[PDB]
Design a protein around this ligand. Structure first.
Ligand SMILES: C[C@H]1C=C2C=C[C@H](C)[C@H](CC[C@@H](O)C[C@@H](O)CC(=O)O)[C@H]2[C@@H](O)C1
Length: 424
């Protein structure tokens, strides 16, 4: 029988295997993250999941915030409070700032942009190039509204994505615009008329300008007063170079080389120069912890950033049938871009305000539900908010390029496990 004064534990091999039950989905998933760091497939990752009740408050950090060894020859850890490059995960923040302007009566979503953005309204549409080889520009048909900007239906694209714009740069129309190695996000012409199609573009850079002009504040100040302050965030900024405490702790960017699949240090412009102006499309540096505070507040509908009914607006399908059909066609045919990250390659989607909306359950009752909102950022950052499931999640890496198979697979494994164990 048992030893006097001591707790009755397992006393031989058979009864020690029994005393602890088998490994659940979350434990197994954590092992997969640890192995991916151990085998040098990723530098590191932070994964986080929350529900509204507080019963789910899960944060795990794996690996390093860089591939460069520090002053003690160690690889410093990626932490929940490590300042990271958000890239397009900034777009959700800028969307929130716009909606706050709407709430305070500074703007109307269906108002034309001409009043606050006459510089955008004046820009032509690039229709193509004649056989002579010169640019064929024309006047826009219809007006861009704020809701066009928030839903990426304005006609704006990104130079690095659209062939017409790539040829536009090639012909030498966009050389004088850039500063400190970062491209002038505002110079290129539009490639369609507003309302014509869903096109991923510089819409939130323009929406950020609109906020600055409507409020009389620069985006950094507006961010601090209206997103950071009410959530107690002190770690979220457009102006990393002016925050020496964040600078000393920041993640380095890592890039996976096409050839040998090896990880290398990525010495890119965004970490050694702020520029002068805040870009609402891609400019924010923040910790995963601070970002989760935003997601969680939206999930809770706690009124700290926006009124519950304004938040509900973000999750409503914004596109009419023709646009919804065209967006789905484009996304299904573009797995090389993969806007939806871990989501199935073929899925019925729409766009809300702030991200892609799933119009059907991803896998019945096993994973994300209809009505869930999602987007991401370049360095394999993925966020989602799932009101019907009562969960929000984020997977933060600092690894380019976007849509890295190892990161996507780990992200899927993380979400699947959390849903399997904790979705209510
Ligand atoms: C929401 C997702 C949509 C995207 C659409 C097209 C691209 C692949 C995005 C990532 C581009 C990024 O990894 C590289 C670019 O920033 C390079 C450049 O701007 O010169 C991606 C990310 O923004 C995340």
């Amino acid at each position: 029988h048992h030893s006097s004064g001591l707790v009755p534990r397992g006393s031989h091999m058979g009864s020690i295997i029994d005393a602890a039950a088998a490994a659940g989905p979350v434990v197994l998933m954590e092992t997969a993250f640890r192995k991916a760091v151990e085998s040098r497939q990723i530098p590191g990752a932070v994964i986080m999941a929350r529900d509204a009740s507080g019963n789910l408050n899960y944060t795990r950090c794996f690996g390093a915030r860089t591939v460069r060894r520090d002053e003690n020859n160690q690889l410093p850890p990626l932490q929940v409070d490590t300042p990271c490059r958000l890239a397009a995960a900034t777009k959700l923040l800028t969307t929130i700032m716009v909606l706050q302007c709407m709430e305070r009566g500074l703007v109307d979503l269906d108002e034309t942009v001409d009043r606050l953005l006459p510089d955008l309204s004046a820009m032509p549409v690039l229709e193509g190039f004649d056989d002579a080889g010169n640019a064929r520009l024309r006047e826009r048909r219809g007006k861009i509204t704020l809701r066009h900007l928030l839903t990426h239906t304005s006609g704006l694209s990104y130079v690095f994505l659209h062939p017409l714009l790539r040829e536009y740069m090639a012909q030498g129309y966009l050389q004088s615009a850039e500063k400190f190695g970062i491209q002038s996000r505002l110079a290129p012409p539009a490639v369609n008329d507003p309302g014509a199609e869903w096109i991923y573009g510089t819409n939130l850079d323009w929406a950020g300008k609109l906020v600055e002009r409507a409020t009389g504040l620069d985006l950094e100040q507006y961010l601090q007063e209206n997103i950071c302050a009410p959530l107690g965030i002190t770690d979220m900024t457009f102006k990393l170079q002016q925050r020496p405490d964040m600078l000393a702790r920041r993640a380095d960017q890592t890039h996976r080389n096409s050839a040998d699949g090896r990880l290398r240090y990525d010495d890119s412009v965004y970490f050694r120069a702020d520029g002068e102006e805040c870009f609402g499309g891609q400019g924010v540096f923040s910790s995963p912890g601070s970002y989760m505070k935003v997601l969680h507040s939206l999930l809770k509908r706690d009124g700290l950033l926006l009124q519950p009914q304004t938040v509900d607006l973000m999750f409503q399908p914004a596109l009419e049938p023709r646009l919804e059909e065209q967006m789905n066609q484009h996304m299904d045919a573009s797995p090389h871009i993969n806007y939806g990250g871990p989501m199935p390659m073929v899925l019925r989607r729409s766009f809300g305000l702030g991200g892609i909306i799933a119009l059907e359950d991803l896998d019945g009752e096993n994973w994300r539900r209809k009505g869930s909102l999602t987007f991401g950022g370049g360095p394999n950052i993925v966020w989602q908010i799932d009101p019907k499931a009562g969960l929000c999640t984020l997977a933060f890496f600092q690894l380019e390029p976007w849509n890295d198979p190892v990161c996507r697979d780990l992200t899927r494994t993380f979400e699947h496990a959390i849903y399997a164990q904790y979705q209510q």
